[PDB]
Design an enzyme around this catalytic site. Structure first.
Site, PDB file in Angstrom:
ATOM      1  N   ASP A  39       0.852  -1.241   0.069  1.00 51.97           N
ATOM      2  CA  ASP A  39       0.220  -0.006  -0.044  1.00 51.97           C
ATOM      3  C   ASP A  39       0.655   1.369   0.057  1.00 51.97           C
ATOM      4  OD1 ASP A  39      -1.902   2.074   0.325  1.00 51.97           O
ATOM      5  OD2 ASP A  39      -2.724   0.993   2.105  1.00 51.97           O
ATOM      6  N   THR A  40       0.990   1.807  -1.040  1.00 52.58           N
ATOM      7  CA  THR A  40       1.756   3.016  -1.252  1.00 52.58           C
ATOM      8  C   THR A  40       1.009   4.299  -0.434  1.00 52.58           C
ATOM      9  OG1 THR A  40       0.916   3.243  -3.396  1.00 52.58           O
ATOM     10  CG2 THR A  40       2.944   2.203  -3.273  1.00 52.58           C
ATOM     11  N   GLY A  41       0.001   4.167  -0.375  1.00 53.25           N
ATOM     12  CA  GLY A  41      -0.865   4.993   0.285  1.00 53.25           C
ATOM     13  C   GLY A  41      -0.877   5.209   1.823  1.00 53.25           C
TER      14      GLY A  41
HETATM   15  C1  LIG Z   1      -3.421  13.762   6.544  1.00 51.88           C
HETATM   16  C2  LIG Z   1      -3.125  13.545   5.162  1.00 51.88           C
HETATM   17  C3  LIG Z   1      -2.704  14.863   4.463  1.00 51.88           C
HETATM   18  C4  LIG Z   1      -2.154  12.362   5.252  1.00 51.88           C
HETATM   19  N1  LIG Z   1      -1.980  11.668   6.549  1.00 51.88           N
HETATM   20  C5  LIG Z   1      -1.214  10.374   5.973  1.00 51.88           C
HETATM   21  C6  LIG Z   1      -0.594   9.481   6.925  1.00 51.88           C
HETATM   22  N2  LIG Z   1      -1.606   8.573   7.346  1.00 51.88           N
HETATM   23  C7  LIG Z   1      -2.441   8.857   8.199  1.00 51.88           C
HETATM   24  C8  LIG Z   1      -1.694   7.265   6.514  1.00 51.88           C
HETATM   25  O1  LIG Z   1      -0.827   6.785   5.751  1.00 51.88           O
HETATM   26  N3  LIG Z   1      -2.531   6.102   6.994  1.00 51.88           N
HETATM   27  C9  LIG Z   1      -2.908   4.950   6.518  1.00 51.88           C
HETATM   28  C10 LIG Z   1      -4.139   5.075   5.590  1.00 51.88           C
HETATM   29  O2  LIG Z   1      -5.172   4.965   6.148  1.00 51.88           O
HETATM   30  N4  LIG Z   1      -3.901   5.547   4.197  1.00 51.88           N
HETATM   31  C11 LIG Z   1      -5.186   5.718   3.328  1.00 51.88           C
HETATM   32  C12 LIG Z   1      -4.917   7.412   2.887  1.00 51.88           C
HETATM   33  C13 LIG Z   1      -5.293   8.238   3.970  1.00 51.88           C
HETATM   34  C14 LIG Z   1      -4.230   8.929   4.409  1.00 51.88           C
HETATM   35  C15 LIG Z   1      -4.761  10.016   5.618  1.00 51.88           C
HETATM   36  C16 LIG Z   1      -6.204   9.926   5.680  1.00 51.88           C
HETATM   37  C17 LIG Z   1      -7.122   9.264   5.078  1.00 51.88           C
HETATM   38  C18 LIG Z   1      -6.692   8.503   4.120  1.00 51.88           C
HETATM   39  C19 LIG Z   1      -5.032   4.949   2.269  1.00 51.88           C
HETATM   40  C20 LIG Z   1      -4.494   3.236   2.219  1.00 51.88           C
HETATM   41  O3  LIG Z   1      -4.265   2.936   0.921  1.00 51.88           O
HETATM   42  C21 LIG Z   1      -6.337   2.606   2.476  1.00 51.88           C
HETATM   43  C22 LIG Z   1      -5.724   1.262   3.058  1.00 51.88           C
HETATM   44  C23 LIG Z   1      -6.859   0.568   3.328  1.00 51.88           C
HETATM   45  C24 LIG Z   1      -7.527  -0.768   2.466  1.00 51.88           C
HETATM   46  C25 LIG Z   1      -8.670  -1.402   3.091  1.00 51.88           C
HETATM   47  C26 LIG Z   1      -8.847  -1.120   4.375  1.00 51.88           C
HETATM   48  C27 LIG Z   1      -8.148  -0.278   5.328  1.00 51.88           C
HETATM   49  C28 LIG Z   1      -7.217   0.502   4.939  1.00 51.88           C
HETATM   50  N5  LIG Z   1      -6.968   2.760   1.477  1.00 51.88           N
HETATM   51  C29 LIG Z   1      -8.389   3.456   1.657  1.00 51.88           C
HETATM   52  O4  LIG Z   1      -8.555   4.140   2.848  1.00 51.88           O
HETATM   53  O5  LIG Z   1      -9.017   3.487   0.588  1.00 51.88           O
HETATM   54  C30 LIG Z   1     -10.503   4.058   0.491  1.00 51.88           C
HETATM   55  C31 LIG Z   1     -10.938   3.821  -0.864  1.00 51.88           C
HETATM   56  C32 LIG Z   1     -10.586   4.245  -2.044  1.00 51.88           C
HETATM   57  N6  LIG Z   1     -11.357   3.637  -2.969  1.00 51.88           N
HETATM   58  C33 LIG Z   1     -12.212   2.807  -2.393  1.00 51.88           C
HETATM   59  S1  LIG Z   1     -12.262   2.467  -0.651  1.00 51.88           S
HETATM   60  C34 LIG Z   1      -2.838   3.970   7.536  1.00 51.88           C
HETATM   61  C35 LIG Z   1      -3.041   2.168   6.702  1.00 51.88           C
HETATM   62  C36 LIG Z   1      -1.456   3.959   8.101  1.00 51.88           C
HETATM   63  C37 LIG Z   1      -1.046  10.274   4.555  1.00 51.88           C
HETATM   64  S2  LIG Z   1      -1.655  11.970   3.921  1.00 51.88           S
END
Ligand SMILES: CC(C)c1nc(CN(C)C(=O)N[C@H](C(=O)N[C@@H](Cc2ccccc2)C[C@H](O)[C@H](Cc2ccccc2)NC(=O)OCc2cncs2)C(C)C)cs1
EC number: 3.4.23.16
Lengths: 99, 99
Positions: B25-27
Site C-alpha cells: 500500500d503506497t498510500g
Molecule cells: C493527513 C494527510 C494529509 C495524510 N496523512 C497521512 C498518513 N496516514 C494517516 C496514513 O498513511 N494512514 C494510512 C491510511 O489509512 N492511508 C490511506 C490514505 C489516507 C491517508 C490519510 C487520511 C485518510 C486516508 C490509504 C490506504 O491505501 C487505505 C488502505 C486500506 C484498504 C482497505 C482497508 C483499510 C485500509 N485505502 C483507503 O482508505 O481506501 C479508500 C478507498 C478508495 N477507493 C475505495 S475505498 C494507514 C493504513 C497507516 C498520509 S496523507
C-alpha cells in the site's frame, strides 16, 4: 517515471480544470478527492477505510491527468483527509509496483 | 518482481512465524496488521485512515518477509479491516511505483 517510496508518492493531477496534488495509492480500490467542484451527474455512495466510512459523491467517467497522463474514470468527492488516486485510475496510466 | 494493479496487490508475508496475506500500500505511511500474536514489547498508538481512526499496538523492529524479501521495522496490530504493508517496509524491499 519511476517513483520510489521514501517519501509520500504525491503527484500533480488536473481535474475539472483545477490543479491538485494526490497520493498514488495502490491500497485504494477507488479514487477519492477532497471537496471540489466537478461537472455532471453523480450518485451518493459510501466508502470505507481504516477508522470507518465516509459519505461521498460518485462521479462517473471524469477525465483526469495524473503526473502528465490522461485517464477517464470514476472519481469520488468527499471529506477525505487526503486526495487519493486509487487502482481504477492507476491501471489507466499504466502504473506498476516494482521490487 | 513487477506487479501491475488490475487486481489488489496482495502478497504473502511471514511474520511472527505466521503466514498472512497483505496489501502493498503506497498510500500508507505505516504497516498495520489484523489482531495477531507478536513477541516483544509495544507502546499503544493511534492511527487514522479515511473513515476516522483505530487504536493499535506498535511493535518496533519486527522482522518480516514480504513476497520473499526480508525487512525489519515497525508493525502496528489492531482491528484493521485489512493487512497493509506501508511505506516503512515497502522502502526496505526496494519497492517502486512505475508508469
Ligand atoms: C493527513 C494527510 C494529509 C495524510 N496523512 C497521512 C498518513 N496516514 C494517516 C496514513 O498513511 N494512514 C494510512 C491510511 O489509512 N492511508 C490511506 C490514505 C489516507 C491517508 C490519510 C487520511 C485518510 C486516508 C490509504 C490506504 O491505501 C487505505 C488502505 C486500506 C484498504 C482497505 C482497508 C483499510 C485500509 N485505502 C483507503 O482508505 O481506501 C479508500 C478507498 C478508495 N477507493 C475505495 S475505498 C494507514 C493504513 C497507516 C498520509 S496523507
Amino acid at each position: 517515471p519511476q517513483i520510489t517510496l521514501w517519501q509520500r508518492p504525491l503527484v500533480t493531477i488536473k481535474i475539472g480544470g483545477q490543479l491538485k496534488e494526490a497520493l498514488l495509492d495502490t491500497g485504494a480500490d477507488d479514487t477519492v478527492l477532497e471537496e471540489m467542484s466537478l461537472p455532471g451527474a453523480w450518485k451518493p455512495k459510501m466508502i470505507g477505510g481504516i477508522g470507518g466510512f465516509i459519505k461521498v459523491r460518485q462521479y462517473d467517467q471524469i477525465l483526469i491527468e495524473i503526473c502528465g497522463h490522461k485517464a477517464i474514470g470514476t472519481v469520488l468527492v468527499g471529506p477525505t483527509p487526503a486526495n487519493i488516486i486509487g487502482r481504477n485510475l492507476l491501471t489507466q496510466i499504466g502504473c506498476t509496483l516494482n521490487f
